[PDB]
């Protein structure tokens, strides 16, 4: 959610020529957030229907 | 009856109560909370004090809430509550 | 002896003993101690923690065992005549199958006692549960079959006093929604069945409803009324949701009396939806909010079949949601995880103002806040009741917060305009 | 030197309290700045009820200590405790 | 007394009382009828009084009530004009609590009575003045129907037919004021009727005395009152000292002073400069103290006005009576031009006067027909909060601004 808030803050930063550099810098944080989200989704799936 | 029994049990659900006597004017209790001889003795006291309280209320005002009068004492918070037919009295602790 | 047992079993005498125990509980609740210190010397540590979450404060927990086990909080209603009274609709006692399928319970704000002041016990599961808006001592709700029952809060018999008709013409489907509606002079016991039977009934007559209407739209596709609300003063207008995730306005009068609008944005059956319950210096009748079983909450508007805005922060399927009754910004939500999601958009929009999912995931299913909204009852299905008090700095809306609420709504209109322009331009050739 | 007057006002301006009048040890209404007849009659009936309550106490135990008898009277329910020194009224509404 | 005080001031008793009071404080610490408080209970004619023992052939003398006995209101009926055999002076009382058309006392008199009042300063007795002009006083304690005290008008006394009189001063010092037709300003002692406490055939405008058709003193104004001429020259009536008398004949009306009272409303905003006034020329115009010109006006009825008075609680609301058989009460913040609720008299009957409740929950209405009806009043607008009084003071300053703006717009907008 915090990463989504940061992405929402940076969504208007297309004009600034630093969106690509910021993405290259924060790809690690994005991957960590994605790993946490995948872990949560796996836990939900392991929750038996 | 059993609803009144549960009401008495809930009023007595608070542990540590010395005794609450659902009472009657005949000197015996409808449902006391002590040993039977002491229950009968305190229930005779309850019937006597109930007649006394009815008279004292009528002396004060004969058109009042003819249901109850607590006595929160430093020895026993006596919640006397006599009905028209049946009666009750709860000689309880002051905290409840 | 036997005379004492008869007097205990005597109906007038047992009723007098019950009223006596009621006043006894009233006095024992009034029985405050004598060694008190009201100067506030014990609130400094609370004041040392007030600056970090005093907006939420659970008040009590109306938890029992006589009917609580295997009985969720099926519905909640705070009594209009006595705001210090709240209800607790129980689910079908599976653990107590010897006991019936519905026994009403009173969560009390007037006093803090586990013993309810009023109970309505019946053999059917209470789906809906509406308190008497125009009456002081009446109780009614919706059966799992659908036949509405009757009871009285002041009385001393938990049985269903009257029962509504039960028939094919009557409520064959379960009574999903029911409320005390209509004027004080021209009332309407409006009820909603699962199949779409819009059941405006009469308080006097438990046989003939004032206006009964099965509902269907979209080439008469059957209406599974999921989300229910209605407009204030517009008895004709009402809010309808579908288990197929379809929203619609409901018309009570008119040639198209029935499903009026048609809206759809959700990805689940319509779980939690309440009207914009706050009225201040701005009239926002043209908008509302909704939630479903898709871990998201969708705001709505009168003219917008597409949902107004999304509160999708839920990590799991939602159960209930309600706009606040005083603050336009604030809006509380619930889920099977106890997702207390009081969200004041003017205060906190991206995150909720108070997002508190229950540890251990308590099953918050149905709820009703205070009449002033100062406290909101929240409860697990097993019976973990929480009535969170509201910090008035967050609770009380500003005077300009309705004009500023219109300002924020226009800001949302502009942001959604940006999003819709992005949607239009994003289609490639 | 005004604690007595402050206490009389506090028990007088108390919620549900219809009056806190300092009556004598015998119970006759000493502090009576109102209709003395009704006040004295109420104080005397309160003294009679206090005698009945002391009788009930002695039926339990004579030398017991009392905090405040909470007599439920519709005209004026009294959560008071009489004595042999003076009689200041303690009668307030449970709802207030 | 002293013994009871000593009992309350006994050190052991005082300490026990303090401890017990602290402990007790700690230990004790139909449906549609409610929908018309602003919509009908704000003005609900409830007590229509008509006792045919007096309601036959008579009129209403004045309006009075007991501040000493707030449940008691005095039904001042005038002379039996069409019944010469019936006496020309008698009194009636309307009970707010008791549901009896009969009086608590019938202060009889030989002659026609113009003005009268009860006495909170002297709760056992009341007083009145004749339509001819002889004053008198009666007590409900006694057993004689006629007023036992009877201040006889004479050449020495107030010969002109008195209409303005008030019990000036409370029980601490009561010098009951009076005024003849010529305005014999006559304070009357609380127990002396042979000699009034004072007497003044006052005059102003080079001593050109007139008929003060209205009068009103401020709250606690022992040294001031109003003098509203039937000529329309509202004299500034200082009441005490060597400076007492008709000072400044304000001209804020075009007829005889029909209805007028002090700005009796109490609140955050002080209305010490205000003045409420109605003329007999079918024009009611509220005046000001410093500005002798009228502050604002209300002249709806083509007929004149039976009465007019500032509301005792709401600065916005006011109590007025019109001769058109219509109720006259307007909340100035809410409704200034049109009345707030212009109810009508039953059959548009001829009204005489009015008497608001001290709590403001009721107000009398004059009735020459005979059914003396009193309108039960709600608290929708009559209840002035201090902020609502502050809102009314803001409205008053805005009204002053609007009057100055009207003056400027008339200066810049006169066609010639």
XYZ file of N, CA and C in Angstrom, chain C residues 27-238:
636
model
N -30.530 0.237 39.375
C -29.929 0.796 40.577
C -28.498 0.312 40.767
N -28.248 -0.978 40.531
C -26.900 -1.519 40.633
C -25.977 -0.930 39.583
N -26.517 -0.553 38.425
C -25.778 0.247 37.464
C -25.573 1.670 37.953
N -26.546 2.224 38.669
C -26.371 3.513 39.320
C -25.547 3.410 40.595
N -25.228 2.194 41.040
C -24.482 1.973 42.279
C -23.003 2.261 42.038
N -22.650 3.538 42.132
C -21.257 3.958 42.052
C -20.628 3.885 43.439
N -19.298 3.822 43.478
C -18.578 3.646 44.732
C -18.493 4.969 45.497
N -17.848 4.921 46.663
C -17.767 6.072 47.546
C -16.336 6.572 47.748
N -15.323 5.788 47.384
C -13.925 6.196 47.539
C -13.348 6.766 46.250
N -14.175 7.451 45.466
C -13.793 7.875 44.126
C -12.853 9.075 44.152
N -12.139 9.258 43.043
C -11.284 10.417 42.795
C -11.598 10.912 41.383
N -12.553 11.835 41.279
C -13.006 12.342 39.989
C -12.124 13.457 39.440
N -11.042 13.813 40.138
C -10.180 14.903 39.698
C -9.396 14.565 38.436
N -9.357 13.297 38.036
C -8.672 12.912 36.821
C -7.204 12.591 36.974
N -6.750 12.236 38.177
C -5.348 11.895 38.388
C -4.948 10.579 37.732
N -5.910 9.776 37.279
C -5.634 8.495 36.643
C -5.744 8.538 35.124
N -5.916 9.720 34.529
C -6.040 9.846 33.083
C -4.795 10.408 32.410
N -3.745 10.730 33.173
C -2.538 11.302 32.582
C -1.811 10.291 31.702
N -1.699 9.041 32.163
C -1.130 7.992 31.322
C -2.008 7.726 30.108
N -3.329 7.793 30.283
C -4.229 7.783 29.137
C -3.985 9.001 28.256
N -3.807 10.173 28.873
C -3.435 11.362 28.114
C -2.037 11.232 27.525
N -1.154 10.486 28.190
C 0.121 10.143 27.592
C 0.012 9.191 26.424
N -1.121 8.502 26.293
C -1.405 7.672 25.138
C -2.557 8.195 24.291
N -3.185 9.309 24.682
C -4.307 9.853 23.918
C -3.837 10.386 22.571
N -2.628 10.951 22.522
C -2.105 11.525 21.286
C -1.691 10.472 20.264
N -1.966 9.193 20.510
C -1.614 8.100 19.614
C -2.749 7.079 19.544
N -3.950 7.532 19.190
C -5.029 6.600 18.918
C -6.225 6.676 19.846
N -6.518 7.863 20.370
C -7.722 8.056 21.169
C -8.981 8.142 20.315
N -8.830 8.175 18.990
C -9.990 8.196 18.110
C -10.767 6.889 18.187
N -10.111 5.806 18.589
C -10.756 4.512 18.759
C -10.704 4.113 20.226
N -11.856 3.740 20.780
C -11.924 3.314 22.176
C -13.142 2.408 22.324
N -12.899 1.104 22.428
C -13.987 0.168 22.667
C -14.641 0.455 24.012
N -15.973 0.445 24.027
C -16.732 0.808 25.216
C -17.090 -0.397 26.077
N -17.782 -1.380 25.509
C -18.220 -2.545 26.262
C -18.254 -3.747 25.326
N -18.786 -4.862 25.832
C -18.898 -6.092 25.045
C -20.145 -6.837 25.522
N -21.250 -6.649 24.800
C -22.489 -7.332 25.148
C -22.422 -8.790 24.718
N -21.673 -9.597 25.462
C -21.451 -10.996 25.137
C -22.162 -11.871 26.154
N -22.796 -12.935 25.667
C -23.579 -13.810 26.527
C -23.316 -15.270 26.193
N -24.148 -16.162 26.721
C -24.071 -17.571 26.360
C -25.462 -18.166 26.188
N -26.479 -17.489 26.733
C -27.841 -18.013 26.681
C -28.344 -18.121 25.251
N -27.898 -17.227 24.373
C -28.201 -17.324 22.957
C -27.042 -16.928 22.054
N -25.859 -16.640 22.603
C -24.775 -16.096 21.791
C -24.070 -17.165 20.962
N -23.945 -18.380 21.493
C -23.154 -19.411 20.834
C -23.805 -19.854 19.529
N -22.977 -19.983 18.485
C -23.422 -20.317 17.129
C -24.489 -19.348 16.634
N -24.337 -18.070 16.967
C -25.331 -17.061 16.605
C -24.575 -15.757 16.353
N -24.354 -15.463 15.078
C -23.629 -14.271 14.663
C -24.463 -13.035 14.944
N -23.845 -11.867 14.804
C -24.590 -10.619 14.851
C -25.250 -10.459 13.494
N -26.473 -10.973 13.368
C -27.137 -11.013 12.073
C -27.560 -9.631 11.600
N -27.940 -8.754 12.522
C -28.355 -7.404 12.181
C -28.228 -6.553 13.431
N -28.162 -5.241 13.228
C -27.999 -4.309 14.333
C -28.834 -3.066 14.082
N -29.531 -2.608 15.118
C -30.355 -1.414 15.032
C -30.379 -0.718 16.383
N -30.063 0.571 16.378
C -30.153 1.402 17.569
C -31.545 2.011 17.628
N -32.196 1.892 18.782
C -33.580 2.328 18.907
C -33.678 3.842 18.777
N -34.614 4.298 17.944
C -34.761 5.729 17.703
C -35.304 6.440 18.935
N -36.357 5.888 19.538
C -36.945 6.509 20.721
C -35.972 6.493 21.893
N -35.253 5.388 22.078
C -34.253 5.259 23.135
C -32.914 4.997 22.468
N -32.133 6.043 22.185
C -30.828 5.835 21.542
C -29.857 5.027 22.380
N -30.070 4.936 23.688
C -29.242 4.134 24.580
C -29.514 2.646 24.465
N -30.271 2.220 23.459
C -30.599 0.819 23.248
C -30.161 0.380 21.859
N -29.559 -0.805 21.786
C -29.167 -1.416 20.527
C -29.569 -2.884 20.534
N -29.789 -3.426 19.340
C -30.284 -4.790 19.191
C -29.142 -5.710 18.782
N -29.392 -7.022 18.804
C -28.388 -8.004 18.383
C -29.124 -9.200 17.773
N -29.258 -9.187 16.448
C -29.917 -10.289 15.759
C -28.985 -11.491 15.700
N -29.500 -12.645 16.101
C -28.703 -13.847 16.266
C -28.887 -14.777 15.077
N -27.820 -15.493 14.737
C -27.915 -16.507 13.703
C -28.521 -17.787 14.271
N -28.725 -18.762 13.388
C -29.309 -20.035 13.786
C -28.347 -20.787 14.690
N -28.797 -21.092 15.905
C -27.945 -21.763 16.872
C -27.704 -23.196 16.431
N -26.618 -23.408 15.691
C -26.241 -24.764 15.322
C -25.738 -25.533 16.533
N -24.906 -24.891 17.356
C -24.434 -25.524 18.582
C -25.580 -25.739 19.559
N -26.552 -24.839 19.558
C -27.734 -25.034 20.381
C -28.900 -25.342 19.455
N -28.813 -26.429 18.687
C -29.967 -26.846 17.880
C -31.171 -27.223 18.718
N -30.964 -27.608 19.979
C -32.083 -27.741 20.903
C -32.787 -26.406 21.078
N -32.023 -25.328 21.164
C -32.598 -23.999 21.130
C -33.043 -23.656 19.712
N -33.906 -22.652 19.565
C -34.439 -22.327 18.235
C -33.427 -21.634 17.337
N -33.864 -21.207 16.151
C -32.957 -20.601 15.185
C -32.825 -19.092 15.341
N -33.631 -18.460 16.187
C -33.460 -17.036 16.402
C -33.893 -16.561 17.772
N -32.988 -15.906 18.491
C -33.287 -15.311 19.786
C -32.643 -13.937 19.820
N -33.468 -12.897 19.832
C -32.926 -11.553 19.781
C -32.265 -11.194 21.105
N -31.328 -10.252 21.031
C -30.568 -9.820 22.193
C -30.407 -8.310 22.141
N -30.344 -7.690 23.312
C -30.232 -6.243 23.427
C -28.828 -5.905 23.904
N -28.056 -5.243 23.047
C -26.813 -4.618 23.470
C -27.139 -3.238 24.023
N -26.762 -3.005 25.274
C -27.283 -1.881 26.039
C -26.248 -0.772 26.141
N -26.643 0.433 25.732
C -25.835 1.613 25.996
C -26.311 2.347 27.241
N -27.570 2.137 27.637
C -28.074 2.734 28.870
C -27.354 2.169 30.085
N -27.034 0.880 30.057
C -26.352 0.223 31.160
C -25.338 -0.765 30.604
N -24.406 -1.179 31.458
C -23.403 -2.184 31.105
C -23.741 -3.471 31.850
N -24.601 -4.288 31.247
C -24.970 -5.580 31.807
C -25.067 -6.595 30.681
N -24.560 -7.804 30.929
C -24.681 -8.870 29.944
C -26.128 -9.286 29.731
N -26.992 -9.050 30.707
C -28.398 -9.408 30.574
C -29.097 -8.438 29.633
N -29.690 -8.908 28.540
C -30.421 -7.998 27.655
C -31.728 -7.542 28.278
N -32.120 -6.314 27.939
C -33.400 -5.791 28.400
C -34.566 -6.368 27.612
N -34.355 -6.693 26.341
C -35.407 -7.233 25.495
C -34.850 -8.373 24.658
N -35.652 -9.423 24.498
C -35.276 -10.593 23.713
C -36.484 -11.040 22.905
N -36.249 -11.434 21.660
C -37.283 -12.000 20.804
C -36.777 -13.345 20.307
N -37.323 -14.421 20.859
C -36.900 -15.772 20.531
C -37.903 -16.414 19.583
N -37.395 -17.041 18.524
C -38.263 -17.668 17.536
C -37.505 -18.775 16.818
N -38.267 -19.660 16.180
C -37.715 -20.868 15.581
C -37.056 -20.632 14.229
N -37.012 -19.400 13.739
C -36.405 -19.095 12.453
C -35.231 -18.146 12.641
N -34.261 -18.245 11.738
C -33.087 -17.388 11.814
C -33.462 -15.968 11.416
N -33.103 -15.008 12.264
C -33.462 -13.612 12.049
C -32.508 -13.031 11.014
N -32.953 -12.966 9.761
C -32.120 -12.400 8.710
C -32.104 -10.885 8.831
N -33.257 -10.257 8.639
C -33.368 -8.835 8.901
C -33.807 -8.605 10.343
N -33.568 -7.385 10.832
C -34.002 -7.004 12.176
C -34.136 -5.482 12.204
N -35.371 -4.999 12.142
C -35.656 -3.572 12.103
C -36.311 -3.143 13.407
N -35.778 -2.089 14.012
C -36.380 -1.494 15.194
C -37.491 -0.532 14.785
N -38.403 -0.283 15.722
C -39.573 0.536 15.433
C -39.185 2.008 15.381
N -39.246 2.593 14.183
C -38.923 4.007 14.034
C -39.987 4.883 14.681
N -41.257 4.587 14.421
C -42.362 5.402 14.903
C -43.028 4.840 16.152
N -42.536 3.729 16.691
C -43.155 3.118 17.855
C -42.122 2.888 18.946
N -42.547 2.903 20.213
C -41.582 2.773 21.314
C -41.306 1.349 21.781
N -42.265 0.437 21.642
C -42.182 -0.872 22.295
C -42.538 -1.994 21.325
N -41.937 -1.974 20.138
C -42.199 -2.983 19.122
C -40.889 -3.548 18.586
N -40.935 -4.813 18.170
C -39.779 -5.506 17.609
C -40.245 -6.382 16.454
N -39.473 -6.387 15.367
C -39.821 -7.153 14.175
C -38.546 -7.443 13.398
N -38.549 -8.551 12.665
C -37.384 -8.963 11.911
C -37.739 -9.935 10.806
N -36.704 -10.404 10.107
C -36.888 -11.255 8.945
C -36.442 -12.693 9.120
N -37.360 -13.631 8.904
C -37.063 -15.043 9.100
C -36.132 -15.568 8.016
N -35.463 -16.682 8.327
C -34.685 -17.384 7.314
C -35.577 -17.896 6.196
N -36.797 -18.309 6.531
C -37.787 -18.560 5.496
C -38.225 -17.255 4.849
N -38.469 -16.232 5.661
C -38.889 -14.932 5.175
C -40.114 -14.354 5.850
N -40.914 -15.145 6.562
C -42.109 -14.612 7.208
C -41.710 -13.719 8.376
N -42.041 -12.433 8.277
C -41.640 -11.469 9.294
C -42.379 -11.756 10.590
N -41.664 -11.666 11.703
C -42.235 -11.918 13.013
C -42.438 -10.587 13.726
N -43.147 -10.639 14.850
C -43.392 -9.459 15.660
C -43.059 -9.754 17.112
N -42.596 -8.723 17.810
C -42.282 -8.823 19.226
C -42.342 -7.425 19.822
N -42.212 -7.356 21.144
C -42.261 -6.091 21.867
C -41.095 -6.027 22.838
N -40.401 -4.889 22.853
C -39.272 -4.735 23.762
C -39.730 -4.596 25.205
N -40.864 -3.935 25.429
C -41.329 -3.704 26.792
C -41.974 -4.953 27.383
N -42.330 -5.919 26.542
C -43.119 -7.063 26.983
C -42.240 -8.072 27.726
N -42.835 -9.205 28.094
C -42.149 -10.266 28.829
C -42.451 -11.621 28.193
N -42.322 -11.694 26.868
C -42.491 -12.952 26.141
C -41.665 -12.875 24.865
N -40.570 -13.634 24.813
C -39.641 -13.575 23.689
C -40.194 -14.203 22.421
N -41.335 -14.877 22.488
C -41.877 -15.542 21.323
C -42.260 -14.527 20.252
N -42.287 -14.949 18.992
C -42.808 -14.065 17.947
C -44.275 -13.773 18.187
N -44.580 -12.527 18.546
C -45.930 -12.129 18.926
C -46.864 -12.338 17.746
N -46.585 -11.657 16.648
C -47.274 -11.899 15.394
C -46.267 -12.363 14.357
N -46.757 -13.088 13.362
C -45.946 -13.519 12.239
C -46.588 -13.031 10.952
N -45.761 -12.575 10.016
C -46.267 -12.180 8.720
C -46.713 -13.418 7.958
N -47.504 -13.237 6.904
C -47.930 -14.387 6.103
C -46.734 -15.114 5.512
N -46.876 -16.425 5.373
C -45.854 -17.270 4.781
C -46.497 -18.090 3.677
N -46.147 -17.779 2.435
C -46.827 -18.349 1.282
C -45.982 -18.076 0.049
N -46.412 -18.649 -1.076
C -45.832 -18.275 -2.360
C -46.072 -16.802 -2.639
N -47.300 -16.342 -2.402
C -47.585 -14.918 -2.505
C -46.838 -14.140 -1.436
N -46.614 -14.756 -0.285
C -45.895 -14.113 0.802
C -44.397 -14.378 0.638
N -43.611 -14.100 1.674
C -42.153 -14.092 1.567
C -41.632 -15.521 1.554
N -41.622 -16.124 0.366
C -41.016 -17.442 0.220
C -39.500 -17.367 0.351
N -38.883 -16.378 -0.284
C -37.449 -16.210 -0.163
C -37.106 -15.628 1.204
N -35.872 -15.824 1.667
C -35.458 -15.216 2.935
C -35.517 -13.696 2.871
N -35.925 -13.094 3.987
C -36.130 -11.646 4.061
C -34.751 -11.020 4.242
N -34.145 -10.626 3.122
C -32.807 -10.051 3.168
C -32.807 -8.724 3.910
N -33.729 -7.836 3.562
C -33.766 -6.501 4.133
C -35.178 -6.166 4.577
N -35.274 -5.352 5.628
C -36.552 -4.862 6.129
C -36.268 -3.654 7.003
N -37.131 -2.647 6.915
C -36.933 -1.447 7.713
C -38.275 -0.790 7.986
N -38.304 0.009 9.047
C -39.473 0.805 9.397
C -39.410 2.085 8.576
N -40.282 2.193 7.579
C -40.263 3.290 6.629
C -41.643 3.939 6.601
N -41.797 4.912 5.710
C -43.029 5.658 5.593
C -43.137 6.760 6.630
N -44.138 7.613 6.436
C -44.340 8.740 7.330
C -44.857 8.266 8.684
N -44.823 9.174 9.660
C -45.458 8.889 10.941
C -46.956 8.685 10.761
N -47.565 9.436 9.842
C -48.973 9.231 9.526
C -49.158 8.162 8.456
N -48.326 8.176 7.415
C -48.424 7.226 6.309
C -47.169 6.364 6.319
N -47.207 5.292 7.103
C -46.043 4.447 7.302
C -45.992 3.348 6.245
N -44.888 2.604 6.242
C -44.704 1.489 5.315
C -43.657 0.551 5.889
N -44.066 -0.669 6.240
C -43.140 -1.677 6.757
C -42.474 -2.359 5.568
N -41.513 -1.649 4.981
C -40.860 -2.126 3.771
C -39.926 -3.274 4.113
N -40.017 -4.352 3.343
C -39.141 -5.496 3.514
C -38.695 -5.985 2.148
N -37.543 -6.642 2.121
C -36.962 -7.157 0.890
C -36.622 -8.624 1.083
N -37.107 -9.456 0.170
C -36.778 -10.870 0.150
C -35.628 -11.114 -0.814
N -35.067 -12.320 -0.730
C -33.952 -12.680 -1.599
C -34.373 -12.679 -3.061
N -35.563 -13.204 -3.350
C -36.023 -13.292 -4.729
C -36.356 -11.923 -5.303
N -36.525 -10.920 -4.451
C -36.847 -9.594 -4.927
C -38.210 -9.131 -4.463
N -38.809 -9.864 -3.531
C -40.133 -9.489 -3.064
C -40.046 -8.233 -2.213
N -40.237 -7.079 -2.847
C -40.309 -5.823 -2.115
C -41.586 -5.834 -1.292
N -41.441 -5.982 0.020
C -42.569 -6.251 0.903
C -42.793 -5.046 1.804
N -43.560 -4.082 1.312
C -44.089 -3.038 2.172
C -45.288 -3.609 2.911
N -45.155 -3.761 4.218
C -46.185 -4.376 5.034
C -46.819 -3.310 5.924
N -47.713 -3.752 6.802
C -48.373 -2.877 7.756
C -48.078 -3.362 9.166
N -47.866 -2.414 10.083
C -47.644 -2.780 11.477
C -48.885 -3.416 12.086
N -50.068 -2.973 11.666
C -51.304 -3.530 12.204
C -51.584 -4.916 11.635
N -51.377 -5.096 10.332
C -51.786 -6.309 9.635
C -50.571 -7.162 9.309
N -50.560 -8.390 9.826
C -49.502 -9.355 9.558
C -49.942 -10.391 8.531
N -50.971 -10.070 7.752
C -51.450 -10.947 6.696
C -51.254 -10.323 5.322
N -51.770 -9.115 5.116
C -51.674 -8.457 3.829
C -50.623 -7.365 3.893
N -49.537 -7.469 3.134
C -48.595 -6.349 3.057
C -49.235 -5.157 2.364
N -48.797 -3.960 2.755
C -49.308 -2.746 2.127
C -48.947 -2.703 0.651
N -47.735 -3.131 0.309
C -47.313 -3.195 -1.083
C -46.298 -4.315 -1.223
N -46.705 -5.403 -1.866
C -45.838 -6.544 -2.115
C -45.484 -6.585 -3.593
N -44.199 -6.753 -3.894
C -43.756 -6.741 -5.285
C -42.463 -7.531 -5.403
N -42.526 -8.675 -6.077
C -41.308 -9.329 -6.522
C -40.613 -8.453 -7.555
N -39.286 -8.431 -7.503
C -38.504 -7.518 -8.326
C -37.714 -8.277 -9.381
N -37.610 -7.665 -10.561
C -36.796 -8.165 -11.663
C -36.581 -7.035 -12.662
N -35.395 -6.981 -13.258
C -35.090 -6.040 -14.325
C -34.144 -6.719 -15.303
N -33.652 -5.937 -16.268
C -32.734 -6.410 -17.306
C -33.336 -7.608 -18.046
N -34.420 -7.307 -18.764
C -35.296 -8.308 -19.374
C -35.835 -9.261 -18.311
N -36.262 -8.668 -17.194
C -36.896 -9.376 -16.081
C -36.000 -10.465 -15.499
N -34.690 -10.242 -15.499
C -33.789 -11.132 -14.781
C -34.065 -10.999 -13.290
N -34.128 -12.132 -12.594
C -34.534 -12.147 -11.195
C -33.575 -11.329 -10.339
N -34.136 -10.633 -9.357
C -33.402 -9.657 -8.563
C -33.013 -10.298 -7.238
N -31.718 -10.555 -7.064
C -31.182 -11.014 -5.786
C -30.723 -9.787 -5.006
N -31.627 -9.271 -4.179
C -31.402 -8.006 -3.484
C -30.282 -8.200 -2.468
N -29.090 -7.694 -2.786
C -27.929 -7.854 -1.918
C -27.672 -6.611 -1.073
N -27.478 -5.466 -1.711
C -27.235 -4.219 -1.004
C -28.541 -3.450 -0.903
N -28.852 -2.970 0.291
C -30.107 -2.281 0.527
C -29.859 -0.939 1.197
N -30.504 0.085 0.655
C -30.579 1.413 1.251
C -31.713 2.140 0.542
N -31.972 3.370 0.963
C -33.037 4.158 0.363
C -32.753 5.627 0.608
N -33.376 6.514 -0.156
C -33.134 7.944 0.032
C -34.020 8.528 1.121
N -33.450 9.497 1.836
C -34.158 10.156 2.927
C -35.246 11.041 2.339
N -36.488 10.797 2.749
C -37.621 11.516 2.218
C -38.141 10.996 0.899
N -37.344 10.225 0.163
C -37.805 9.606 -1.075
C -38.152 8.157 -0.761
N -39.406 7.962 -0.352
C -39.903 6.619 -0.087
C -39.914 5.800 -1.367
N -40.173 6.451 -2.503
C -40.093 5.758 -3.782
C -38.677 5.263 -4.046
N -37.686 6.124 -3.845
C -36.306 5.791 -4.156
C -35.731 4.835 -3.121
N -35.033 3.813 -3.605
C -34.331 2.901 -2.719
C -33.148 2.309 -3.467
